[PDB]
Amino acid sequence: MKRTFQPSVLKRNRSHGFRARMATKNGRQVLARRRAKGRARLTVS
Amino acid sequence: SRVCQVTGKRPVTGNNRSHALNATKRRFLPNLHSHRFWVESEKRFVTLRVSAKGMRVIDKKGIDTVLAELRARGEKY
Amino acid sequence: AAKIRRDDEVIVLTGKDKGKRGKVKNVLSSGKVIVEGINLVKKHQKPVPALNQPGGIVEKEAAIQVSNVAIFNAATGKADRVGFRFEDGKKVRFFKSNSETI
Amino acid sequence: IREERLLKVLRAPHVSEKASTAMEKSNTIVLKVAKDATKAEIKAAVQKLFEVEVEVVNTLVVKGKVKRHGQRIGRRSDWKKAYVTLKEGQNL
Amino acid sequence: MKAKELREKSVEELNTELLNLLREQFNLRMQAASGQLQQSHLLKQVRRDVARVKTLLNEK
RNA sequence: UACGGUGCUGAAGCAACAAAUGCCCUGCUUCCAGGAAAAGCCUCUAAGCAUCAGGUAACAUCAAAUCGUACCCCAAACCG
RNA sequence: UGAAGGUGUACUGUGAGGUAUGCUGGAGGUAUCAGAAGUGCGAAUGCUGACAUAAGUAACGAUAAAGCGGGUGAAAAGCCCGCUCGCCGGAAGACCAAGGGUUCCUGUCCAACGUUAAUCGGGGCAGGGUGAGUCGACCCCUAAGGCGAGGCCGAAAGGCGUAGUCGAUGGGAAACAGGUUAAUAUUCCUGUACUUGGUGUUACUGCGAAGGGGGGACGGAGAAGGCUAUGUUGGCCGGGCG
RNA sequence: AGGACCGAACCGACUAAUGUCGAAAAAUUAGCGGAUGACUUGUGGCUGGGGGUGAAAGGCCAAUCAAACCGGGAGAUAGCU
RNA sequence: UAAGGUGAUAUGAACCGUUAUAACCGGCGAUUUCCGAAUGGGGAAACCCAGUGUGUUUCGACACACUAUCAUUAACUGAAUCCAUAGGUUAAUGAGGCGAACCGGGGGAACUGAAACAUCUAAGUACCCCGAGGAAAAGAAAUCAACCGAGAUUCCCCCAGUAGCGGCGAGCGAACGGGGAGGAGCCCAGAGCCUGAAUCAGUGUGUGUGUUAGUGGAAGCGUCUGGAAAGGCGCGCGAUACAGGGUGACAGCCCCGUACACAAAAAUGCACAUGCUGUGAGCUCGAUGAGUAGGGCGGGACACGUGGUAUCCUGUCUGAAUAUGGGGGGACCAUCCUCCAAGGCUAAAUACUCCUGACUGACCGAUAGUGAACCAGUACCGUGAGGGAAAGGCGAAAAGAAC
Numbered sequence A: 001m002k003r004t005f006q007p008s009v010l011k012r013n014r015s016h017g018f019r020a021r022m023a024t025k026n027g028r029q030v031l032a033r034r035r036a037k038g039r040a041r042l043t044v045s
Numbered sequence B: 001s002r003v004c005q006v007t008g009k010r011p012v013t014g015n016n017r018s019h020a021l022n023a024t025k026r027r028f029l030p031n032l033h034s035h036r037f038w039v040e041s042e043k044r045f046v047t048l049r050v051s052a053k054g055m056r057v058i059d060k061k062g063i064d065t066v067l068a069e070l071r072a073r074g075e076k077y
Numbered sequence C: 001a002a003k004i005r006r007d008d009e010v011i012v013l014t015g016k017d018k019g020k021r022g023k024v025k026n027v028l029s030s031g032k033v034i035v036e037g038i039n040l041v042k043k044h045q046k047p048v049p050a051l052n053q054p055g056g057i058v059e060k061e062a063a064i065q066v067s068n069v070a071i072f073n074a075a076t077g078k079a080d081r082v083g084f085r086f087e088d089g090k091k092v093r094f095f096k097s098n099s100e101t102i
Numbered sequence D: 001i002r003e004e005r006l007l008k009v010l011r012a013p014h015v016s017e018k019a020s021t022a023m024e025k026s027n028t029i030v031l032k033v034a035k036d037a038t039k040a041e042i043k044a045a046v047q048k049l050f051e052v053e054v055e056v057v058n059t060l061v062v063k064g065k066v067k068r069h070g071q072r073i074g075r076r077s078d079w080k081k082a083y084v085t086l087k088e089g090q091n092l
Numbered sequence E: 001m002k003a004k005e006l007r008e009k010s011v012e013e014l015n016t017e018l019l020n021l022l023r024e025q026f027n028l029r030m031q032a033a034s035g036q037l038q039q040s041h042l043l044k045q046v047r048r049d050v051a052r053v054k055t056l057l058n059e060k
Numbered sequence F: 001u002a003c004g005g006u007g008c009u010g011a012a013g014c015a016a017c018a019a020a021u022g023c024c025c026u027g028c029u030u031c032c033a034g035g036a037a038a039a040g041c042c043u044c045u046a047a048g049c050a051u052c053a054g055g056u057a058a059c060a061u062c063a064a065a066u067c068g069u070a071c072c073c074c075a076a077a078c079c080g
Numbered sequence G: 001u002g003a004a005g006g007u008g009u010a011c012u013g014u015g016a017g018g019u020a021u022g023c024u025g026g027a028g029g030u031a032u033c034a035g036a037a038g039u040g041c042g043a044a045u046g047c048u049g050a051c052a053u054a055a056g057u058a059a060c061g062a063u064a065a066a067g068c069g070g071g072u073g074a075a076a077a078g079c080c081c082g083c084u085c086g087c088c089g090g091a092a093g094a095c096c097a098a099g100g101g102u103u104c105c106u107g108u109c110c111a112a113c114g115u116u117a118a119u120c121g122g123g124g125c126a127g128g129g130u131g132a133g134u135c136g137a138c139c140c141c142u143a144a145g146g147c148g149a150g151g152c153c154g155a156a157a158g159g160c161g162u163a164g165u166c167g168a169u170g171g172g173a174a175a176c177a178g179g180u181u182a183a184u185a186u187u188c189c190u191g192u193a194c195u196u197g198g199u200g201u202u203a204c205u206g207c208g209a210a211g212g213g214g215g216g217a218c219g220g221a222g223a224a225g226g227c228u229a230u231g232u233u234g235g236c237c238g239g240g241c242g
Numbered sequence H: 001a002g003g004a005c006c007g008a009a010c011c012g013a014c015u016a017a018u019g020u021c022g023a024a025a026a027a028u029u030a031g032c033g034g035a036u037g038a039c040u041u042g043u044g045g046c047u048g049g050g051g052g053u054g055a056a057a058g059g060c061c062a063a064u065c066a067a068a069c070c071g072g073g074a075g076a077u078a079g080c081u
Numbered sequence I: 001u002a003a004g005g006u007g008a009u010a011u012g013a014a015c016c017g018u019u020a021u022a023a024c025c026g027g028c029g030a031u032u033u034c035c036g037a038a039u040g041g042g043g044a045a046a047c048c049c050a051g052u053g054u055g056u057u058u059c060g061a062c063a064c065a066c067u068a069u070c071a072u073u074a075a076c077u078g079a080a081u082c083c084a085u086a087g088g089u090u091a092a093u094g095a096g097g098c099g100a101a102c103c104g105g106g107g108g109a110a111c112u113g114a115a116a117c118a119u120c121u122a123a124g125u126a127c128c129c130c131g132a133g134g135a136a137a138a139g140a141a142a143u144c145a146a147c148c149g150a151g152a153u154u155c156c157c158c159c160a161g162u163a164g165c166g167g168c169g170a171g172c173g174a175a176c177g178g179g180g181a182g183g184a185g186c187c188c189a190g191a192g193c194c195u196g197a198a199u200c201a202g203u204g205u206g207u208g209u210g211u212u213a214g215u216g217g218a219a220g221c222g223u224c225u226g227g228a229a230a231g232g233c234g235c236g237c238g239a240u241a242c243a244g245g246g247u248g249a250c251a252g253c254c255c256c257g258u259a260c261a262c263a264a265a266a267a268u269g270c271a272c273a274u275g276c277u278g279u280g281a282g283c284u285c286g287a288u289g290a291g292u293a294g295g296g297c298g299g300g301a302c303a304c305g306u307g308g309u310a311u312c313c314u315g316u317c318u319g320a321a322u323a324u325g326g327g328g329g330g331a332c333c334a335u336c337c338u339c340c341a342a343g344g345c346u347a348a349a350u351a352c353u354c355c356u357g358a359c360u361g362a363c364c365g366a367u368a369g370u371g372a373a374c375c376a377g378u379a380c381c382g383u384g385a386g387g388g389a390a391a392g393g394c395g396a397a398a399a400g401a402a403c
């Protein structure tokens, strides 16, 4: 009966994507953490 | 930003102590203004965002002496 | 500085084939020689379609540790330890006790 | 005209049914090419290496089939195949 | 080979690169893909022999 | 006929009538709640330059690169 | 010439426990007296794993419905082909976008997966399959909005914003039938098209903007007229004489 | 002409039964209201936590709301079990 | 250095060598797709779209180079008004981002404790932000002491849970003085004779040398038991080497090693001779840091909560004297003692481990130890930030079971 997740690759990437994070101050800290934890998927792409 | 050109007076912080000593963080902004100073040497007006004490420094020394120091630090006028 | 090597008459010190002589086939990177007519293991080799397919038991010359063998002297007539020296310009090996040269 | 690099395009001649049917019955050749390799570059390569007359080159990119075994997944590499339609002077 | 290729002319050194590319590399790369080659070692040594020459034409 | 389909040949191929929520219609009538923008497209001249460069036709020739193209899509393949 | 661990037995101490030994195990163990502790668990709706219970019980996911024959194969209610029967048909049909991402198609294999069986499969394992000047994206244009040189403002981070530059859900060049593979087609092949560029010749010739003007360029409802997609009838055609 | 009328798509959710370890963490069946407008819907934007948004119920802000979620202060504190 | 190699899961294939241009390990080179500060413009990271100049070409075209913003910097142009300044082009030049703690600055909570709670505490802690460096900061007295004199900072131990502070509750809590670690001192607010002599900051350059490849590197047997000997058993035999690890059961002597002795063409990390673009000595006379010290108001820092409150920092409003002078000595004042602010630099002791080697554990031994002994920050969960598993051992050797 309709759900929270209604996927869209444009919105996904615009919202959470690498260029969306790397833009901001806190975004560049988000990546700096994932890199420190040593993850494969840094961001969705 | 609220920073005098001459003195480097910037907005320091501190408490706002009541009668009952209820501390509450506040700011102490300096008395900044825009003012046009007649530079006799170069025969033109110069705008500086100085504080009220700065004006008395410019009264004490020559505006040339202040614009010597302002140019030395790497500011603009 | 490999003491035991390719074309060398060795004798086995320890193992089921204790006191048996043979020439080395090929020493490996792991540190395990293979000597002719020594560690004969009856492998059940399967008749694989590609190439030859004998289909039966076969006595393979399995590997043995380098430390378990030793070079034969052919003078005193028993196992012997190896050294290294500089005869002329080059480096060469030699025997300990009856100190000659290979 | 662009020596050396022309040789670094054409990977292999593709073998299949669709590759066979297009040899005899439509005068073309299928072949695998380097991931870039423009339709000019492939034509120019065929015109030198195979040294035969070319009508036109059609091109498409095959995707990597995700293969798995034991435990770990494994995406195959992508690659570009080129349907090269030859002219009336042909052989291979 | 490197020592003998080091004593060669700059324009002459291209011909060997283009000879390594024209025949040899491409020919073996196709010939291997078609299934007309047991001798797969020739793919390797030629690829190194290219690199050798392409490094040796960086003298200035 | 591997019994799946391949090859061959192939007559007529009309009028009437009914008819959309399709199109003419980004039209016409009207009502007020008064109904994006900006390029391509046409046109006008500024700064310049005339034996040129440019513009208009007619023909010839060359080019049109790269990516997606399978399959599901009111669903057993998406969201639960 | 059998350690720890496991498992039994027979003694022994007031108790925590000790001692000796048959089986298993196949390599470590540790007297004594000291020293140090992650030092002893049945409970915390304790934590993790394994295994019970209800129990071979409920349920097997729409009340659209199956039946018989022949084939395949070890085996067929469920697979394949056949003849009936039934259900959807403004969908339970056929094409797109979004989103999935090989599920497509061929060969072979049923351990698991499928709420049963399985020769079948959106399951496993190999191989194959996605062809564009015209369709869509990219590209030229801009809306909402985003970013934003200088700039203004702000303890710092940063906020706003101009010139700009992005940003489609909108505007902007042109292809349709027909055929074909196991799987692609307005993309390949037969036929007939059109478009927008570049370069050369010939004959003419005032062209020229980041600038002006035109257009692009526009709501709701309503009404009628004219048409076609589409159907329907007759005619023509081939078959039929049940 | 109409926040007109009846009535499918579409939008909603009044009654009843069913279901309540469900087919389903809000549905099905039979009826039910709106259905040219204060309508509905796709795509893309903007608004962010004492903040948003709200034809106002303390409703809604990712199955969580009289102050979201994740991480940190942090082993908070517990005269209680 | 070297007789075997072509990394592993993992055999197979096809070839290179063998007293030495195989393989391997080093040093310095070349190569270094695309994204990413990303930097030609853009963008949904790993994509799209360009511009200007060079050489070539057979029309089709490629090829390599350069073009971000900003800061200091010169050059040339440049306005509203005459030169003007703003402003606009090019070359030179550095910055930009990332990484674990440590450190200096700018901001800065709350739970909690007080058996409630507002002062207070937690605490200038958590956190956020900026800026460094191998450490950083601090620093040569306008210091602190008691008529004795000490002589920059930093850290450790005391002094001392003392003196003080405090709803005088909770709590917080010094200094002087003494032991040590450690040592070090100078420039500018300028003139004479005289000048390269002390001093460092670079270049080449020397040995004592050490660092990234290394090489050598001692000495065991006969028996018995067992699948297998290092084991029991008997004589040995080396030790500047019985640290340690392997090998078919516990190895000083089978092998790796170990002490121990020697290693480097290059890249060097260094410390002394050291020619030297370049830098300034001895000594006269004279100067000795103003919108500053201090004060009024409001805050903060000092153990010190405005209190009788010294002292430092300041937002605001003010304002001295300037060596026949001024600060400090814990309200304040007078003689004595003390120092010279408002300008600067500065090594070591101290903090710290993302990281590359040794070496040790009354540390763990797969529910432990890192979340992670295993292809784990993986699978899987979540829109996202983020959360986050389970999963070790055949044997001595695959001899992994022909038929």
Ligand SMILES: [K+]
Residues within 6 Å of the ligand: none
């Ligand atoms: K018609």
Ligand SMILES: [K+]
Residues within 6 Å of the ligand: H073
């Ligand atoms: K706390």
Ligand SMILES: [K+]
Residues within 6 Å of the ligand: I041, I042, I049
């Ligand atoms: K652009």
Ligand SMILES: [K+]
Residues within 6 Å of the ligand: none
């Ligand atoms: K030795």
Ligand SMILES: [K+]
Residues within 6 Å of the ligand: I289
């Ligand atoms: K001064």
Ligand SMILES: [Mg+2]
Residues within 6 Å of the ligand: none
């Ligand atoms: Mg979900």
Ligand SMILES: [Mg+2]
Residues within 6 Å of the ligand: A011, A014, A015
């Ligand atoms: Mg969005």
Ligand SMILES: [Mg+2]
Residues within 6 Å of the ligand: B023
């Ligand atoms: Mg407080």
Ligand SMILES: [Mg+2]
Residues within 6 Å of the ligand: B074
């Ligand atoms: Mg500046």
Ligand SMILES: [Mg+2]
Residues within 6 Å of the ligand: D059, D060
């Ligand atoms: Mg294509």
Ligand SMILES: [Mg+2]
Residues within 6 Å of the ligand: D077, D078, D079
């Ligand atoms: Mg590939």
Ligand SMILES: [Mg+2]
Residues within 6 Å of the ligand: D076, D077, D078, D079
């Ligand atoms: Mg591949």
Ligand SMILES: [Mg+2]
Residues within 6 Å of the ligand: D075, D076, D077
């Ligand atoms: Mg790959």
Ligand SMILES: [Mg+2]
Residues within 6 Å of the ligand: D077
């Ligand atoms: Mg591959």
Ligand SMILES: [Mg+2]
Residues within 6 Å of the ligand: F025
């Ligand atoms: Mg109309």
Ligand SMILES: [Mg+2]
Residues within 6 Å of the ligand: F026
């Ligand atoms: Mg029209």
